[PDB]
Amino acid sequence: ATTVSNLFAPAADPGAAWYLLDTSRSLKPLIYQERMKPSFTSMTKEDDEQV
């Protein structure tokens, strides 16, 4: 705690143990979508909006 100066939060870590700080967790990789076919509802009805 500093009475006046509160600039930022420089962080120091050992990063050498079996684990690391703020470990990341993922279930499955990233998926991408292209609703461009004529069968897509919005791109035929929503003023031809494709997403």
Place this chain on the structure above:
Amino acid sequence: ATTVSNLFAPAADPGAAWYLLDTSRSLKPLIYQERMKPSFTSMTKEDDEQV
């Protein structure tokens, strides 16, 4: 325009010129997107509606 009670407006146009007095220009001709698919939203997946 002359007289009172203005009448309908005929028009005199030549046809010899290959570039006619008017012109209808289009990016694409007629195109159709009949969605006869079992997975289409409104035929089996939102309603019993074929479009």
